[PDB]
Amino acid sequence: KCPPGTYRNTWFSGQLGSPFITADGVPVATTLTELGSGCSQCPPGTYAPTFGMSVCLPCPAGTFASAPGATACQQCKPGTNSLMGDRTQQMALVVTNAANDFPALRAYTISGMVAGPAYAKPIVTGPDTNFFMAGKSETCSTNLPGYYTDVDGLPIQLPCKPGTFMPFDTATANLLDTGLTVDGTQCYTCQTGTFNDEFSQPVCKACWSGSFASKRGLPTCEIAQPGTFTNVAAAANATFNTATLIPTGLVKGAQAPTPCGMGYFQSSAETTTCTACAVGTYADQAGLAAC
Amino acid sequence: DKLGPTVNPTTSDAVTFTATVASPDSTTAVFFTLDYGDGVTAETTRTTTGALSTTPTANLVSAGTYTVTYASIGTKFVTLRLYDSAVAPGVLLASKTVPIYVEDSTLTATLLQSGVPRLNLAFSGFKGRVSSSTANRADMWATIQLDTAPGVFESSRIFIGIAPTASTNYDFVIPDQVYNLEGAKTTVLRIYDAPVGGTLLRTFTPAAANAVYVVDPSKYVLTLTVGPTSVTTADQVTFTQTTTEVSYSASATSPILQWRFNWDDPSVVETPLAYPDALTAASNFPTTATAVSSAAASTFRYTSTGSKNARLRLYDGANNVIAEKIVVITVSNAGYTLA
Amino acid sequence: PTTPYTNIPTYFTFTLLRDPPVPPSASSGVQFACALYTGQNVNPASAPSAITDAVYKTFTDVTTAVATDANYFADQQLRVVTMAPGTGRVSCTFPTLYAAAGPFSPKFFVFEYASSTVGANALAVADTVTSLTSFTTQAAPTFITGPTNVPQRVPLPKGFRTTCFDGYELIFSNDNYTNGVRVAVDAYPYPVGQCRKCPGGTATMDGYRCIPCPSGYWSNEGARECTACPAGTIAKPAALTARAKYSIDPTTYHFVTHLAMGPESCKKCPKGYFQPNIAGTVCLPCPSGFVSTSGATGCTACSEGTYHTDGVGTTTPGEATSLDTTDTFGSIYPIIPNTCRQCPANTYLPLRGQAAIASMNLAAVSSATPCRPCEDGTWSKAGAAGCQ
């Protein structure tokens, strides 16, 4: 029988490994084998625990095997995850090699609101063409900004739950306290004056002026109750540039209720400005719902 | 190979053969004979060849009478055999065999594509008729094959049914299949008698511009430009049918898709499904921008003061849109004041 | 092989050969005292004073050691191992803990052990040391090497699914996948976990990996267990080619070259080869004399008065056609002779199934037929089993 870690098929020998290390993006006709038997070595991305088998089976999800002669697959690191291609390659929208078109796989397809005043449903358009987890013929790829991976073994990268946001890198962030660094594996809670009503969000949107938010990690904005107002200028959700699919320019809204001053009321909730009390009626204390 | 009809031959038609012979080693003369699957029909004699050499020589059936009409339908093993001398038995140098499938003329098979198969997306709008001329027919299987390209392979065996009685048509459902070429295809619906192997009974053909064409919905670009947006319920929005240009911009030869526009207001039903301007049915969709209608101008007033999604979408066959362009229009009633 | 990891407790194994003078099976066991010094000065302070075997052979009795004796990792340790009779090779095992990184030089010595005493150098000549290659310990990478893990009770928005079910491998895509065929594209705002069917040749249970079958079997796109190929068949995986543009839906992974897509892949053996097994990864050439028929399960013995050579002169030979081998398989199964021939007049075959002996060079030694001169005073009427 063939030794473990190798194989031999009558219909095909040889290894085609690492098709995302070469710049072109094509496999290599590897023919390495163990001398004594001559059985063909397992292609990078598979393994062979048993002694005798013809086809040696792909690496399962959440695992990897860079070396051809792999006895078994290793669980990806706590931070990173398993997904064909590297992060930048998965994050690349432009192409260089026209013929192969290899470094152009568009795996992100992020929901974020497009550059400019428009708001286009996911910026990258078209079917995801490169999606397999199992085939992993290289080091474990780092995690898409929206998602995260807590434990070592994880088939698919998990999205950050509502009221949380995992930025792309530590420096390329918007609102992070300067005593922490995003290593991927742990998802940081949204800062006061933000909302996040969906998963896999690389940064949570700042609440529109009317509604405000006080506590940390709030899945929805808190309604400005009648008797106050919320004025703020820089309260604009970040603008995902199409060049690198990264958000930027987020500024938080009003953290406090900031009640309506004396002689000034607000009957209607979810309001930015405060209305003056009419003639004949008075406002005795600040924060009065009505006159 | 079979030099006769490109389609798998039926009993009547009778086939011709091409068989070039070459010899990179030596340039001598040999004599060839042709056995047929039904050896009763004919047993050819030994005829002389010339020179041969590395280059292939147009030989065998040039103006010969080796064409044989078969009787039974099935797989027949034609056998070329080369001999050194022209005496029995001689010395057989080589013997190449070739299988030739002969189908049944009685059975008919037709393929219907309901809608235009989109790219990537799975297209289920297929259907197959099998009208048998015989009274009783046995159980039958079919195999869809999307294209004749080497990369695409024949699908699994589907059990279409029995077609037990009469000469009536028996529809069979075809399971979903995914295309990826965004170009013209050559769809082949083969039919077998048994589940595994057996024999070929019919092979359908796209047949001259009824071919499955793959369409990318992304390529289509449609402009709407219909009046203002912020106007109120009083103001009438104007649909300028001449200004709404629809274009494919991918390839010249694409199927036509009738358009249809909706106000998204319950007051008025959706527009009737019609073709682009100055274009008839069963023609190529225009690659350049063209209006939906020649001379039209609609005026609409929204009853309710809400957000209205004026949407124009292209249908074909089944009501499965491939290209939709929506535009939002807002309505306000608080601008008015009287004193 | 040269350099071990820094802080992992490394086992060291030394193979000792007694060479052709292997102690006889009928004898008593022999013992040897393999002793080594790693090079580090973590344990008993200083390094050994000299290289001579005298000091080396008195390091410590370490043959028995519990993991928590504080001596389980001694820089210099001597153990005693035994060769049982009837074996020449011995393995000596020493655990070694390297606290810090740096160049080290392990010095290994071997001594014949007899009656609790340590002897001289077991190698020829006294005071010869097998110095191991001086290495520098590298960092120890952490990597658990088990199967896939699964997270318990994590919140997912709508479609995202941690674990797909039988016959559907896991995908990470925005597009609206139903079953394994997709319905709509670019529906979910972000990409999420879907399930694909898996192509024909493959078959998946508990699906994260979508595994092609072993050569013996054949599969259909969405089956749990990959289907066995019939007895008299091969299941030749049809060449799959590849994807050329990296913007085309991939059938399967990239290392996958061929797949056994559907029952049609189970082609049947040509005449002259039988396939008894059910896996049937390669067809079995029928042995000398025995003769097959089409895809055969068992070779039929050739009758008496007959041998086994080609049958080109005879009519209706059971030879493999060029179609059945070149077109379906190629060059792996050439055309071998398959038929029975009658030996001519005045010779006879009493036994059954003796084929014609061949020759691999013709101009040197000619091949003949294994029938007999038919002892004098007797004749035979062409193919016969007994001379009259």
Side-chain angles (χ1 to χ4, degrees):
Chain A
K1 286 182 191 153
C2 268
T6 71
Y7 79 101
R8 94 181 310 271
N9 190 309
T10 198
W11 300 113
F12 53 84
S13 72
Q15 298 75 56
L16 299 183
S18 63
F20 303 71
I21 306 307
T22 56
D24 277 28
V26 293
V28 291
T30 294
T31 321
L32 294 170
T33 169
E34 161 285 310
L35 60 175
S37 301
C39 291
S40 295
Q41 206 143 239
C42 262
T46 63
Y47 54 70
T50 278
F51 271 61
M53 80 220 74
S54 50
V55 85
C56 94
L57 82 186
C59 200
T63 61
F64 82 111
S66 265
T71 309
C73 267
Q74 317 201 335
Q75 304 301 295
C76 273
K77 292 298 293 143
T80 60
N81 74 290
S82 75
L83 176 50
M84 51 66 68
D86 297 354
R87 161 135 76 175
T88 53
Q89 293 166 26
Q90 288 160 15
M91 186 168 268
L93 313 188
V94 309
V95 71
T96 81
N97 178 14
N100 209 6
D101 219 293
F102 146 77
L105 67 99
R106 282 154 283 190
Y108 210 149
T109 308
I110 201 170
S111 177
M113 172 294 323
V114 297
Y119 184 10
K121 314 202 71 83
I123 301 185
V124 202
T125 311
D128 293 338
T129 314
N130 306 66
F131 34 70
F132 297 126
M133 283 35 62
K136 193 70 193 152
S137 177
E138 72 285 40
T139 184
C140 294
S141 78
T142 46
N143 324 71
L144 268 296
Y147 306 76
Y148 76 102
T149 51
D150 187 283
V151 301
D152 296 44
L154 255 186
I156 200 148
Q157 75 191 336
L158 277 278
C160 272
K161 77 152 192 282
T164 55
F165 76 117
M166 173 35 98
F168 166 56
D169 311 0
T170 59
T172 57
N174 312 121
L175 304 172
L176 285 183
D177 188 30
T178 63
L180 45 83
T181 47
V182 293
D183 60 330
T185 188
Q186 174 307 303
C187 193
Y188 286 73
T189 62
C190 279
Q191 181 164 352
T192 190
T194 52
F195 57 120
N196 184 48
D197 64 312
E198 60 282 85
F199 302 62
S200 154
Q201 267 271 349
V203 73
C204 43
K205 312 189 218 299
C207 290
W208 64 67
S209 176
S211 51
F212 80 99
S214 61
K215 301 294 186 70
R216 216 146 298 159
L218 287 167
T220 179
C221 304
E222 172 296 345
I223 175 143
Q225 296 188 60
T228 181
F229 71 120
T230 45
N231 201 339
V232 64
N237 324 297
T239 167
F240 294 73
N241 75 88
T242 324
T244 49
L245 294 170
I246 201 173
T248 174
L250 188 71
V251 180
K252 82 175 189 172
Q255 63 164 310
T258 198
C260 262
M262 259 204 288
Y264 271 95
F265 82 109
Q266 190 56 253
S267 174
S268 53
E270 281 200 327
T271 41
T272 296
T273 57
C274 197
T275 59
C277 265
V279 65
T281 180
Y282 72 101
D284 182 54
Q285 323 94 320
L288 272 185
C291 308
Chain B
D1 36 16
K2 172 225 306 176
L3 179 58
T6 298
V7 47
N8 286 303
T10 189
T11 291
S12 266
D13 49 37
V15 299
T16 76
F17 310 94
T18 313
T20 87
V21 183
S23 48
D25 156 77
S26 305
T27 57
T28 65
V30 298
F31 317 129
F32 72 74
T33 174
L34 280 43
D35 182 26
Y36 314 80
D38 46 1
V40 178
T41 50
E43 302 181 10
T44 55
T45 62
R46 303 193 190 183
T47 58
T48 70
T49 59
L52 305 171
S53 83
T54 52
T55 59
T57 64
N59 248 127
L60 175 93
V61 181
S62 45
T65 62
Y66 315 97
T67 64
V68 169
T69 80
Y70 292 76
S72 198
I73 81 194
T75 318
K76 276 67 170 68
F77 305 114
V78 70
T79 316
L80 176 63
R81 288 200 278 265
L82 270 54
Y83 293 80
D84 177 41
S85 198
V87 299
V91 170
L92 307 73
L93 278 164
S95 57
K96 209 209 190 301
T97 50
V98 180
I100 193 168
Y101 315 72
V102 177
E103 280 176 3
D104 196 336
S105 64
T106 66
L107 217 176
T108 58
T110 44
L111 189 61
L112 313 178
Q113 38 167 291
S114 183
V116 179
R118 302 178 290 182
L119 185 48
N120 174 207
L121 288 153
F123 173 75
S124 59
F126 265 119
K127 204 174 296 306
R129 253 181 309 293
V130 282
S131 184
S132 197
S133 186
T134 61
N136 268 238
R137 181 69 73 181
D139 39 36
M140 294 190 338
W141 284 262
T143 56
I144 173 52
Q145 188 198 59
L146 297 206
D147 202 353
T148 196
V152 86
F153 298 107
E154 191 174 24
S155 73
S156 182
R157 284 277 210 283
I158 217 80
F159 172 70
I160 68 172
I162 312 162
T165 165
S167 59
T168 50
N169 303 52
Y170 294 96
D171 268 29
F172 61 89
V173 47
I174 304 160
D176 230 316
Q177 53 264 70
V178 167
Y179 288 93
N180 44 287
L181 202 163
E182 70 151 309
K185 297 272 200 165
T186 67
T187 292
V188 181
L189 176 63
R190 266 158 262 204
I191 285 173
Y192 297 79
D193 161 64
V196 288
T199 168
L200 209 73
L201 272 45
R202 203 77 263 194
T203 189
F204 181 72
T205 323
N210 286 44
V212 169
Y213 194 97
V214 188
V215 164
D216 189 351
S218 185
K219 292 293 187 193
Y220 284 95
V221 317
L222 316 82
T223 192
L224 205 65
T225 168
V226 280
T229 53
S230 188
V231 288
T232 62
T233 176
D235 300 285
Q236 56 181 4
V237 305
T238 56
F239 198 114
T240 46
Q241 296 212 41
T242 64
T243 65
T244 75
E245 288 99 35
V246 294
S247 61
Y248 183 32
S249 81
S251 294
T253 301
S254 46
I256 194 171
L257 296 101
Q258 62 199 333
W259 55 262
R260 166 184 217 183
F261 173 67
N262 192 44
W263 290 127
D264 212 320
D265 197 303
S267 60
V268 181
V269 299
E270 210 174 354
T271 56
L273 295 108
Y275 302 104
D277 83 312
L279 203 63
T280 63
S283 59
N284 299 339
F285 190 93
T287 187
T288 52
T290 197
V292 299
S293 189
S294 53
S298 189
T299 58
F300 189 56
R301 284 190 187 77
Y302 287 111
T303 57
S304 51
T305 60
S307 186
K308 308 290 189 180
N309 296 31
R311 47 162 188 74
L312 166 63
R313 54 221 300 191
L314 314 181
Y315 303 76
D316 201 66
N319 294 14
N320 54 347
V321 299
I322 65 159
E324 191 166 310
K325 154 72 91 163
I326 317 103
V327 167
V328 299
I329 289 170
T330 189
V331 177
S332 175
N333 57 321
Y336 316 99
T337 310
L338 62 83
Chain C
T2 307
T3 75
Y5 290 127
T6 299
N7 294 314
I8 308 314
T10 58
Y11 304 85
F12 277 67
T13 57
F14 291 77
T15 49
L16 285 165
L17 191 52
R18 198 176 162 73
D19 157 79
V22 184
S25 315
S27 186
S28 293
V30 55
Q31 35 195 330
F32 301 76
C34 35
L36 85 84
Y37 165 60
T38 50
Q40 75 189 330
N41 297 27
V42 181
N43 219 39
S46 61
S49 54
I51 273 60
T52 188
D53 69 328
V55 62
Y56 266 70
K57 79 189 187 171
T58 68
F59 280 167
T60 316
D61 188 277
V62 197
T63 278
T64 57
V66 47
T68 178
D69 66 338
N71 309 333
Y72 206 78
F73 314 114
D75 58 325
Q76 40 171 345
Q77 49 179 329
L78 152 65
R79 291 170 174 276
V80 184
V81 316
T82 179
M83 207 146 55
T87 199
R89 223 170 308 283
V90 201
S91 49
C92 294
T93 66
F94 307 85
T96 65
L97 184 57
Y98 292 74
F104 292 118
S105 48
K107 270 66 179 76
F108 183 80
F109 265 94
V110 63
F111 312 114
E112 54 305 350
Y113 189 105
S115 70
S116 189
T117 57
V118 301
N121 194 343
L123 306 179
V125 152
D127 304 69
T128 67
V129 67
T130 192
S131 185
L132 266 55
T133 50
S134 183
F135 57 72
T136 64
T137 56
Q138 310 285 53
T142 172
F143 264 124
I144 39 154
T145 60
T148 81
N149 279 329
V150 59
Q152 72 173 351
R153 312 312 300 277
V154 57
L156 293 177
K158 200 77 200 167
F160 202 112
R161 211 150 42 262
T162 46
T163 56
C164 292
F165 44 104
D166 36 358
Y168 302 93
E169 81 295 20
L170 169 81
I171 278 194
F172 176 71
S173 70
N174 55 260
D175 311 311
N176 191 355
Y177 267 99
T178 60
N179 322 305
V181 283
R182 184 181 311 230
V183 47
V185 294
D186 300 54
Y188 294 94
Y190 31 77
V192 303
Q194 306 296 340
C195 314
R196 221 163 69 79
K197 196 62 164 279
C198 275
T202 36
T204 308
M205 73 191 202
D206 288 316
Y208 318 100
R209 44 158 99 93
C210 179
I211 51 165
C213 314
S215 40
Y217 311 89
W218 62 273
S219 156
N220 237 326
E221 81 303 28
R224 285 187 45 73
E225 299 170 312
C226 175
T227 39
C229 197
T233 44
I234 308 284
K236 168 164 161 69
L240 162 54
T241 76
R243 68 200 275 248
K245 204 43 61 163
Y246 279 88
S247 74
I248 329 304
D249 180 276
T251 52
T252 193
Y253 314 115
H254 42 58
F255 44 86
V256 174
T257 60
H258 302 59
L259 286 186
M261 321 185 318
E264 315 66 350
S265 68
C266 280
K267 324 282 211 153
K268 54 167 62 171
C269 296
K271 270 169 277 288
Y273 310 69
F274 81 135
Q275 189 31 258
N277 304 7
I278 323 302
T281 171
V282 298
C283 208
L284 266 283
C286 271
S288 56
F290 311 91
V291 58
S292 91
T293 169
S294 193
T297 308
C299 311
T300 69
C302 186
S303 60
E304 297 175 72
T306 43
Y307 51 111
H308 188 151
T309 206
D310 61 58
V312 187
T314 88
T315 191
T316 88
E319 306 310 316
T321 59
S322 71
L323 169 58
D324 287 300
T325 75
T326 41
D327 297 54
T328 37
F329 299 79
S331 52
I332 303 93
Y333 291 78
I335 307 148
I336 68 160
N338 176 103
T339 176
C340 294
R341 274 273 192 76
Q342 289 170 35
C343 278
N346 203 351
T347 178
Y348 81 124
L349 276 195
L351 303 199
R352 75 193 316 98
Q354 320 54 52
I357 271 180
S359 159
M360 281 295 78
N361 37 69
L362 291 203
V365 172
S366 304
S367 49
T369 181
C371 40
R372 343 197 160 190
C374 174
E375 206 78 352
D376 291 0
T378 76
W379 58 289
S380 79
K381 202 190 203 80
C387 276
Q388 199 170 318

